[PDB]
RNA sequence: AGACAACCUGGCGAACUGAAACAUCUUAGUAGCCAGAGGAAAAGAAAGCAAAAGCGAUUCCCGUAGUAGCGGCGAGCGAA
RNA sequence: AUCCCGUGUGAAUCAGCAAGGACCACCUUGCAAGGCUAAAUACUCCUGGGUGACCGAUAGCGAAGUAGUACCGUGAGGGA
RNA sequence: CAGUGCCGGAAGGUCAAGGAAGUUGGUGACCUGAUGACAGGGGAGCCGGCGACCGAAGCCCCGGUGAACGGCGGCCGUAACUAUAACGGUCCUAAGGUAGCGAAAUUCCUUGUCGGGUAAGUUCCGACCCGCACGAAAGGCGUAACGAUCUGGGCACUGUC
RNA sequence: UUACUGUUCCCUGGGAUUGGCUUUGGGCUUUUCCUGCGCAGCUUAGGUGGAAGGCGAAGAAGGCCCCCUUCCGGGGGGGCCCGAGCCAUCAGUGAGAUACCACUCUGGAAGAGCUAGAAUUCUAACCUUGUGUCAGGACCUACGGGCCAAGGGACAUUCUCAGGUAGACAGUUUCUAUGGGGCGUAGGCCUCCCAAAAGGUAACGGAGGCGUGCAAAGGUUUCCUCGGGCCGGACGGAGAUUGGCCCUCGAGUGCAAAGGCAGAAGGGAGCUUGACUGCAAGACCCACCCGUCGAGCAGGGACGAAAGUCGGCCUUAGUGA
C-alpha cells in the first residue's frame, strides 16, 4: 500500500547544544514494523530509529 | 439559557396566594407590573422606606 | 413654515469598472436622492498619545511613508 | 485591541475604573456614561480692486442683438 | 407509486444555536536546588480551549396518492400444404400499452402496396399493416351546425390561357 | 434547471414582551429507617473514630402470637404477657462489642430546593370583537377616545439569534485546439519513427506506456554465468525434474520501447542500512520557472583482510509552482 512513515531517535529534550527530535521519513511499510539504524542524529552516531 | 428578575416586594392588601399583607415573597417581574402595581396590591422594596418604616 | 452656486453634517446608498472571467475585495461609502444649517460647518478640551524619556484641547499644510501593515497576502488599500 | 450599534443578562467607583493591539500580573498615563466654544480650514451663482506668454465671432459662457429665445417633445427634457 | 411531488405518519438514526458535570491551558502571592546563565512546581482570583449528556423541525425511514411530475420491455420456438403463430421459455423493471385510431397536422425508407377517381394524379378519398417515434383529460374516437381556415373533384362562367 | 453562491416568503428551536396555581416525573439537596454467611469463634465480624458505662419505669431480659425480608441459618418488627436484666479489655480476630454516639459508605425509600419537561388550568399585559354604552358648542351605524361587554389567553403578534427551505428573486460561470464551427477525440511525462549521419523540429502524422514497485528487486565482499537445437532415462504428453555437443551478449534485466550489459548491469549467497548529516569547484540543458551529472572535503558508519565501493534503485516516465 506504500504508506509513508517516519522514523525517530532517542529524544532526551535537554538544555544542551540544540538537541532535538530527529525524524527521518521513509516509505513502504506493508508488513510488520521496521526500525532501522539511520544515523547522524543530533548526537553523532545512532541506532534503532523506530516507528 | 437565562432567567429573569425575581423582584422583592411588600404588600398593600391580603394575597389570595402567598401572604396577608406582611410577607416579602419575591413574586416575579411579570407579576409586580400588572396585578401588583396596577391593582396597588403591592409596593416595591425601596431601601428608603425600609429603614424608616 | 419657502429659496440657494459650490463647500459642510446626517440618513439611504447603487452600478458600469479594476481584478485581463468572477461571486470575498475594488470603483466607494463615490454618484445620486432626501433632511438641516452656516458664512463657514463638523471636531474639540483628554477615562488621549506615549515610553523609563516626554507631551499636552481641536482643525489644516509639510514629512515621517507608498514605509509599518492589511489583502482570493490577488487587484489593490495604506496609517500613526 | 481600542470605537460605536440590534437581542439578553447586566458591575465598581478612588485600600476604585478605563487605556497602554487577546489575556494575566507590576508600572505608567486618563479618568466615562451631561453641554457649549473663535481662529488657522474647503467653497463660488456672486460684489469691489488688479493681473493675464487666456479667447476674440463655427473661439470664449449654450448665449457679443426680444438666449434657455425660436424650435422640438404630452412630459421630464433637448436646444441652435 | 419503482424514481420525483404531495399528504399522513415520525418508533429508531444523523440533527444547529443554546444550556451544561467536568477537564485542560495562561497569569500568579508565596516555595525549592544548583559552577557559570534561570528555571519548576504551584494557593486565590481573573481570563481562555475542548467538552459527556440534553437540544425542535428537516432528512433517512414507514404507508396513501397519477384528470400529481411521468413510463408503458426484448431475444428464442413451435399450427392440421408451405407460411403467418391461437400458445409457450428466458433477463427485465414498477409495470410492460388496454379501448379506439392508424403510413394519419405523427411513417423515415416512401411517388409503401391495393381499390376509386383522372386520358395520365408523387396531391386526394376508402382500406391493409413491419405505429422509424399514435394512444386515452400535455385526453382517445366520432360528430349536426359554423369557418374572410387548410384540402381534393365537380356544374355555370369567363382574356387566366 | 436536480450549475455555484445567496436573499425573500414560509416551518421549527433558543431569548425578550411572559404571569396565578396545584400536581406527574428527569437531573443536583437536605434532613427520616433495614443492608453484610474470608476461617480460628460467646457467631451471618460493616469499615473508620469519641470509647468505661449505656439501655430502662416517658417501663428490658424471657416466652404466646401478628407481619415483612429471606441464602427456611436467621433477621427487622406491632400487640399483649412478663418484672430486675440484655452488659467491656474479659481470649480469639489484619479491624469491637448488639452498652452507647456522629453519622457513613455497601444501596434503597420519602415529605424538603434549582432549572427545566408535561399537563391540564383562571385571570392583570397581548390579539380580537361589540348595533352596546356617554359626551364637549353638534354626531361619530363618519374610522377612532374612555367605559364596561363577550370570546381567546400567556399561546399567538412582533424583535433578535439558530437549523431547514420554492429559480419566486438576484449576482455570475459554462475552456482551447479544432485544415469553417458543432458532434467525436485531445490536453502532463517517457520511449521509437517522421527528424534530412551534432543538437533542435511540425502535423486530429504512425506505434506503445506512465500517475508505480522494492526493506528489498537497495549497499557492499564473493561465486557462477544463460538460452535454443541433439543424445540418455518410466508415465511426461509438442512443452515440467536428471546427465553429455553447437552458442550471436537468441536469456534476462518488476512494468513500454530504445540504448546498454555476458571480468557482467544476468542469478545466488554473506553481513548490513549510504534509500546518512553539512556541503561542493565545474559542467549539460538553457525565454524564465524548472531539470541532470558532479571530482573533492568534514562528521559518523556499513561491507571488505586490504585496496576500495556505498548520500537509492542498468539509464531515460512513476509526477505537479
Swiss-Prot record, chain A:
Disulfide bonds: none annotated. Component of the chloroplast ribosome (chloro-ribosome), a dedicated translation machinery responsible for the synthesis of chloroplast genome-encoded proteins, including proteins of the transcription and translation machinery and components of the photosynthetic apparatus. It is found in: Plastid, Chloroplast. It comes from the Eukaryota. This is Large ribosomal subunit protein bL33c. The gene is rpl33. The lineage of its organism: Eukaryota, Viridiplantae, Streptophyta, Embryophyta, Tracheophyta. One of its GO terms (biological process) is translation. Belongs to the bacterial ribosomal protein bL33 family. One of its GO terms (cellular component) is chloroplast. Component of the chloroplast large ribosomal subunit (LSU). Mature 70S chloroplast ribosomes of higher plants consist of a small (30S) and a large (50S) subunit. The 30S small subunit contains 1 molecule of ribosomal RNA (16S rRNA) and 24 different proteins. The 50S large subunit contains 3 rRNA molecules (23S, 5S and 4.5S rRNA) and 33 different proteins. The keyword GTP-binding does not apply. The chain holds residues 9 to 59 of 66 of the full protein. Keywords: Chloroplast, Plastid, Ribonucleoprotein, Ribosomal protein. GO terms for molecular function: structural constituent of ribosome. The keyword Ribonucleoprotein applies.
UniProtKB/Swiss-Prot annotation, chain B:
It comes from the Eukaryota. It is found in: Plastid, Chloroplast. Signal peptide: none annotated. Component of the chloroplast ribosome (chloro-ribosome), a dedicated translation machinery responsible for the synthesis of chloroplast genome-encoded proteins, including proteins of the transcription and translation machinery and components of the photosynthetic apparatus. Component of the chloroplast large ribosomal subunit (LSU). Mature 70S chloroplast ribosomes of higher plants consist of a small (30S) and a large (50S) subunit. The 30S small subunit contains 1 molecule of ribosomal RNA (16S rRNA) and 24 different proteins. The 50S large subunit contains 3 rRNA molecules (23S, 5S and 4.5S rRNA) and 33 different proteins. Belongs to the bacterial ribosomal protein bL9 family. This is Large ribosomal subunit protein bL9c. It comes from Spinacia oleracea (Spinach). The chain holds residues 43 to 95 of 196 of the full protein.
Amino acid at each position: 500500500v506504500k504508506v509513508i512513515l517516519e522514523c525517530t531517535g532517542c529524544v532526551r529534550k535537554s538544555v544542551n547544544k540544540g538537541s532535538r527530535g530527529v525524524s527521518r521519513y521513509i516509505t513502504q511499510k506493508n508488513r510488520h514494523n521496521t526500525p532501522s539504524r539511520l544515523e547522524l542524529r543530533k548526537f553523532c552516531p545512532y541506532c534503532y530509529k523506530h516507528t | 439559557k437565562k432567567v429573569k428578575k425575581i423582584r422583592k416586594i411588600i404588600l398593600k392588601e391580603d394575597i389570595p396566594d402567598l401572604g396577608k399583607k406582611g410577607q416579602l415573597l419575591d413574586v416575579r417581574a411579570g407579576f409586580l407590573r400588572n396585578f401588583l402595581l396596577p391593582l396597588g396590591k403591592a409596593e416595591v422594596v425601596t431601601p428608603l422606606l425600609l429603614k424608616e418604616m
